[PDB]
Amino acid sequence: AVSVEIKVAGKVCDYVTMELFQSVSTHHRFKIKVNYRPDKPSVWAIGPDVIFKQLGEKVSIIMTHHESGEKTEFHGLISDIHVEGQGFVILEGGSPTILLDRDPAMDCYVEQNLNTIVSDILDKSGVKMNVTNNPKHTDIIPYVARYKETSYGFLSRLLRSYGEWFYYNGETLQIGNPEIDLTGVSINATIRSLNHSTYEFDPVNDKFYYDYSGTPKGATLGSRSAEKCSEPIFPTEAKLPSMRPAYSAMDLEHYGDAGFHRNYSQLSQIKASSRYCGIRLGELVVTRVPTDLGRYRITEITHTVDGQGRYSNTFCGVPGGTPVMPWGDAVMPVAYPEMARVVSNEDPKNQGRVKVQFMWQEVDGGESYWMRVQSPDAGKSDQVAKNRGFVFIPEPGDLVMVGFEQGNPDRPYVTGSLFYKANSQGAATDNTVKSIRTRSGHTLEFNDDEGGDWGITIKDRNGCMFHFDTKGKNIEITAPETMTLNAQNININAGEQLNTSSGKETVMQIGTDFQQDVGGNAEIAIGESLTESIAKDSTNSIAGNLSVTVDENLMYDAQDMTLTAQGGMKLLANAKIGLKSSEGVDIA
Template sequence: MFSTYTESAEDSLFSTKPLNNNSNATAIAKHYIPGIHQLVEVKFIVEGKELINYKNFELTQSTQTHHSFTVSFSSDCLGNKETYQMEEGQELLGKNLLVSIRYKHLVDKPERFFSGVIMQVSFDQDHGNEGYLILKGNSPTILLDQAPHMQSFGGTTPVSLDDIVNEILNQGYHQNRFFQSEIKLSKGIRTAYSCQYNETAYNYLARLAAMYGEQFFYDGEILHFGELPHGGKPISLIYGRDVSQVEIRMQARHVNRDFYGYNSFNDEHLHAETETDLDVKGTLAKSSYARSKEIFKAPSLQQAPLKASTDQDVLYAQRGAIGSEGIQVFVTTGVTTIPFLYPGCVVELNMLHPNKKVSRHFTTLVITDIEHTVDALGQYTGKFKAVDAQTGYIPQAFFTMPITEQQIGIVVSNDDPEGKGRVQVQFNWQDASQQTDFIRVMSGDAGSSTAVKRNRGMVFIPEKGDQVMVGFVNNHPDRPFVLGSLFHGGTAAGGGPNNQIKSIQTRSGHTLKFTEEESIEIFDASGNCIVLDTTGKSITVFAPENILLTAKNIQFQASDNISATAGENIVLQAEHDIEQTAGSGFSLTAKDSYTQISARTSLETKEYFVTSKVGRIEATADNLQLSSSFEVEVLSTKKVKMF
């Protein structure tokens, strides 16, 4: 089926250590022959086997998007001649394609590899010819960019950016052992919560890189995330020898960017406190950057594209945006015969002196885009685009910022470790191990005052298990907050034809109920109750046990009557005086009456009548005196005993 091909190429490319590209720069210079363009040998390997008899090969590479390739083979490239049935060709779909590019007929030749995925297999036949087997595909980054997904990281504990990137790559990139990556972050970044929301893994990684000012691209062999790799010894390109049709382009870009952020926990407004200008080295690049700053005077203030916690977070994002934009003030394009350039490759562009056979250094560049074309004879043409290599930045990978709509979640915790009334929420799409970090809860009134430092306003923290509606600050998936709570079929009641009842009820059953029958009821789980009857113009207070009123002064006042009734006893007690006043009559009715005065009793009245079936007046310690300004009458229907 396939021609046998040594697996040393695959073993070299897919070893645990990244390839060393220094040898290419040296070998290219070593094998230069004046006036001769070397022919190129291209080999195509699938699962260690070589596909032969290619007719044309095109490879487009960029730091900003997926690489793509198209290669045409004769119908017998797999051994047997293929037909429209593609009996053997169909097996190639989805396989890893390794491309080896080297010079023909040379020992110790420079070599460059490309690793991709075959995404399309077709058979093209016309005018009665034997037909061609055509393979099309992309860099393995395409495996991260075929369908949107939702997942989150952090929440319970902060997570490092390194861990997020590794997990994403393990899910869809590292499943193929042949695909390499290098994660080398320039910053030790940790975040409380990060969300891949309705976007592909590739889009999410590109967005993360832009948020934190990191670089993210595939160089044909290795997927890079973090610092721009140094790339080894620069490859020397000489205009007039290796390069033709050069365009040196200076262009104005708006590089006066200013980001801001907000930390709600500390109520702190954030901004970049240090200089974020791009450190441009090349002479023309530096001039173009300086002129761009002068050309664009209009301010550009934007919300930082991340959930910033510190000024440093804003600084990372601002530097990344300025770097990606500022690096494009100076762009070089050209056509080359050197087949070993790749995205991220560093080159030294030299110019031949017009009247001398010597070259002089012009600038150092990093390749951002390259289109390779090789025909069946090995004739190669490359079209490249490059920017200044000494800034540490390349143009950001293309991505789309997801717009996060309001959505439903379940409160999984309201035990805010910082005691700020925040809650953790789990969305319907999150699995058991995923939840937000502790997020704020919206209130109808919230703040502080001179008298109230905390919790002035309406304080209602959702309970664990409650269903809530969640919004997102600036529609950013990493910035959720609770808009309010929702009832569902298992928790909702009420409404009805007249919708008569509105209420507030706590977890333990304490209730404030408003009815359209014009009453307000306040009651708790134990039966204590206060009813305000609007129709009856009355207030009822009920307690199963005790009612206690405590105040410096208490006053009962009624325009008509005051009534006090007890099933057992009524006790009136005062540390000093008790005073009772009646404007008309005073009536005291009891089965037995006992009055004890420790000092003296004075009774003053216009008329005084005491009636009793049996009576006695006795002084036990001294004399008893009855006196009158007039007469004292002692009357009896029978006898009067004086002693």
């Protein structure tokens, strides 16, 4: 009925049994039992080697229906060879994506779309495959991380998390929607909850995206009966976060509708079998019992031929018209804090984000996208619109601890910084030093050594210093250049002696009265001339004696001069006493 021909490296294979599993969400896998005729040399004569040199060789499986002429063709590679025994060989392998699932590695992609990511992943591998790279989501993804995943694992998780069809069609690896009797039919229906919603907070845009359950696209009659039965069972809305980061409202809408349609496809399905090789993967089949059971899209199919040559066929189907293919073979990774190095902080969005380089980018170079830096205090207020709290953005070259929001490697952030070897002198003796230092040398330091330099210090590199001496209970303010005090009122109160000392000159400018009240003696010593000028009357009152001793001449000038003594006057001179006047002298 069906003739199956297998060609290994272009040569027709003599097989006894063959199994071939194909799926739109999992590797195709073939297992072929090769016959070795007694006349030809046996497997032991050829050897384990020579036989093992067929690893990676192409395998072509062509299944032909003689009655209808329809052909199913599959091209794959060999990944396993078993030589056991009169002695035969087991050729195991499948779609070339099998050899894409063996290289777990760490990598990242910055500001790239799905097309470029898939092209780069497939270019870095040595497996040869025709590729139809047509993803629907054409937007640039800010950051994607490959976290200990194989090439196939990373690509599968990334593409299926975006709703993109990603499967081997038997000849080419297809990304994106392709836009394309029975013997053991079996229809099943299950109770599934369609009352679910997804959420995602975007801090770069400060938006809370919310998506509720969408509308069915591909639904059979059993699907509708199952949906009707399940509607009363789940009256509460199940809220879940997005497994994949969402950067826009439309992005979350697409994520949510992909999830809803996966659920609705699992609402009811078909499990059929036949002996017809024209039933292909990813195609539509209208199933009839001997009448219509619904149109179903084939998601997986197992073509097989036993020893007698009796071809058989068995397949799974989802309601035809489902926009998204089943989620299978894909597992989202879980990421844990990693040490990294800051490479930049010139954030274009001006949000305090930094760009770091992980430890797996140390040798060959590279950097991440912009990630938030966690702060002990951060926020805003009515008086402080922006940048409230602790704002210390890391400098390039800083060793940092990078945590991951939720478990997602695509959601990294800086949890903090580390003092390892190249930037730490450690704690002082018994700690005792707690300092905030910037890159210019601005120091805000507390010294707790009560037997040493106990106190507080605010200083700069140039020499400005402001010191609390707790042991001595002193305060010092030092400016190498000018120091200026400005206030409406200045109050310099000293409980003991007050000292003022200028190196050059003390200049005292008073715009109004000058009150000086001395409770004790006054001692003025002037090393040069004293010049005094009064714009009005000068009054002096002395309760004791007045003694003025002048070494050189004394001169007094006035308009009228009255010298009245309550006791006696004595004018003593050594040369002369002249009382010349222009009007005469009178004794009265």
